[PDB]
Amino acid sequence: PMFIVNTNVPRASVPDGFLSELTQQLAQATGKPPQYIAVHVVPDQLMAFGGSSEPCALCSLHSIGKIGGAQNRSYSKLLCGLLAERLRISPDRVYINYCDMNAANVGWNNSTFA
Amino acid sequence: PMFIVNTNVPRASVPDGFLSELTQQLAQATGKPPQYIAVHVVPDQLMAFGGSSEPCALCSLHSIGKIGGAQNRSYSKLLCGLLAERLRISPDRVYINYCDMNAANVGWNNSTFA
Amino acid sequence: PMFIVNTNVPRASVPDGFLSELTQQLAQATGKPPQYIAVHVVPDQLMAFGGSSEPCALCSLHSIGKIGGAQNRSYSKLLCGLLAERLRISPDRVYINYCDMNAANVGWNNSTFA
Numbered sequence: 001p002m003f004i005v006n007t008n009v010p011r012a013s014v015p016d017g018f019l020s021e022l023t024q025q026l027a028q029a030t031g032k033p034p035q036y037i038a039v040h041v042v043p044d045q046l047m048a049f050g051g052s053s054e055p056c057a058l059c060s061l062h063s064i065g066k067i068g069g070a071q072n073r074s075y076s077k078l079l080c081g082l083l084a085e086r087l088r089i090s091p092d093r094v095y096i097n098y099c100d101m102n103a104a105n106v107g108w109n110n111s112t113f114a
Numbered sequence: 115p116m117f118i119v120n121t122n123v124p125r126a127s128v129p130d131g132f133l134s135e136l137t138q139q140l141a142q143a144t145g146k147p148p149q150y151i152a153v154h155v156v157p158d159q160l161m162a163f164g165g166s167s168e169p170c171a172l173c174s175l176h177s178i179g180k181i182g183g184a185q186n187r188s189y190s191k192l193l194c195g196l197l198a199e200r201l202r203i204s205p206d207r208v209y210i211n212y213c214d215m216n217a218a219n220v221g222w223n224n225s226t227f228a
Numbered sequence: 229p230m231f232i233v234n235t236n237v238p239r240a241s242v243p244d245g246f247l248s249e250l251t252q253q254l255a256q257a258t259g260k261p262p263q264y265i266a267v268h269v270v271p272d273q274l275m276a277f278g279g280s281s282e283p284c285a286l287c288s289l290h291s292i293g294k295i296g297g298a299q300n301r302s303y304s305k306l307l308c309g310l311l312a313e314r315l316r317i318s319p320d321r322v323y324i325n326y327c328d329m330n331a332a333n334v335g336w337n338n339s340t341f342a
Contacts, residue, residue, distance in 0.1 A: 002286055002323055004234075006118075006154060011274075019276040035278040038323055040234060040286055042273065045156065046125075048133040050149040058116055058152055059221075062325055069218045069228055076221030095116055095152055096221030097176055097213075099325075104297040107287075107304030107324030114297055120232075120268060160239075161268040162247045172230055172268055173335075183332040183342050190335030209230055209266055210335030211290055211327075 001030050001063040003079075004040045009055050009087045011043040018086055029078055030066045049093045056093035057083050064113060067100035115144050115177040117193075118154045123169050123201045125157040132200055143192050144180045163207045170207035171197050178227055181214035229258050229291040231307075232268045237283050237315045239271040246314055257306050258294045277321045284321035285311050292341060295328035 003026055019039050027034040049056035061067075061075060075098070080091035104114035117140055133153050141148035163170035175181075175189060189212070194205035218228035231254055247267050255262035277284035289295075289303060303326070308319035332342035 002325070004286070014274070019274065019281070020279065023276055023279045037279070038275065038277045038284065038286055040273060040275040045154060046128070046133065047152065047154040048137055049152045051134060051137045051151070053133070056152065058118070058154055067219070069226070072218060072221060073225050073228075076226055077224045079221065080224045092223040094222060097116070097215060098219040098221065098226075100219075101325060104300060105295070105326040105328075107300060107307065107326060108322060109320040110305045110308045111301045112297065112304055112326075114301075159268060159270065160242070160247065161266065162251060163266045164263040165248060165251045165265070167247070170266065172232070172266055175335075181333070183340065186332060186335060187339050187342075190340055191338045193335065194338045206337040208336060211230070211329060212333040212335060212340075214333075 001026060001032055001036065001061060002038045003061050005057050005059045006042045006045050006047065007057040007087060007089065008045050008047050008053060009043055009089065013087060014041060014043055015086050025078060025082065029075055030063055054093060055089045057089050058095050060097040060099060062099045062101050064101050064103050064106060067098050072098045115140055115146055115150065115175060116152045117175050119171050119173045120156040120159050120161065121171040121201060121203065122159050122161050122167060123157055123203065127201060128155060128157055129200055135196065139192055139196065143189055144177060168207060169203045171203050172209055174211040174213060176213040176215050178215050178217050178220055181212050186212045229254055229260055229289060230266045231289050233285050233287045234270045234273050235285045235315060235317065236273050236275050236281060237271055237317065241315060242269060242271055243314055250310065253306060253310065257303055258291055282321065283315065283317040285317050287322065287324040288327060289324060290327045290329050292329050292331050292334060295326050300326045
């Protein structure tokens with residue numbers, strides 16, 4: 001799985017250990033080993049949500065499976081919870097795009113996961 | 115809707131008010147309330163279009179609905195027109211990926227839109 | 229086609245000529261003319277892969293067609309090879325999301341490719 005968060009919160013406001021925490025919580029949430037979890041945090045971005053430049057986040061989770069109605073509600077409670085607690089971003093200023101990838105459409109290690 | 119523009123135009127060339135203009139015009143074009151519009155502009159990027167590093171933009175618009183052939187043509191005229199007028203990027207050096215999201219696949223406010 | 233690479237490798241480790249090399253090799257691999265290939269490299273990123281922060285890359289290739297199981301394996305060999313040779317990233321620390329776009333869902337030059 002690949003989780004990306006783009007935010008206007010400054011780099012200094014991202015706690016040490018945030019990438020590790022995302023890695024662990026997403027391994028637990030998706031049930032995939034941590035070795036397959038990739039995380040990417042992009043602070044200091046020029047962005048707005050609803051016209052406002054208060055703190056916000058635009059995110060995506062790409063996963064081969066483990067994407068669906070109930071799972072995505074649970075992921076959203078988890079991830080909004082982490083962004084609120086660690087980055088002080090209100091959950092209603094977060095979008096997360098969930099993307100269920102086909103294994104043949106994910107490249108890794110000179111081939112695909114098919 | 116979530117609109118992202120990545121460009122090699124320098125930050126100083128992005129005019130004040132641009133994120134607001136994008137928000138307002140995307141709300142009108144998609145019909146969505148402006149409170150649901152998120153916008154994100156990433157200048158100073160290392161990119162090329164057609165092998166050339168003249169000004170260009172690589173963009174995406176994700177939306178729950180309001181994506182389709184005729185709608186997307188209209189969005190492209192709007193968004194290319196704004197990028198030409200405000201960032202001086204030629205329309206034929208812009209790509210925009212349009213992505214129709216299922217409501218169950220968009221997290222927001224601790225849940226999803228389903 | 230649009231190819232994006234996000235990486236924690238520093239900007240000074242991206243060699244001169246890399247965006248051109250990506251443009252040329254992707255033109256040859258997808259069979260589309262280089263005038264239509266866009267490329268984007270984003271260095272110095274805050275990211276982890278598998279819980280650690282040795283060099284890694286999170287990438288995407290969006291293309292109107294020319295996406296499929298065998299094609300994508302060949303693209304992955306090519307692109308992991310380039311990232312290893314030029315940015316010293318291990319192929320087992322690269323993820324590439326392949327996305328087959330409908331022509332009507334790609335904006336360009338004030339309209340779409342439909």
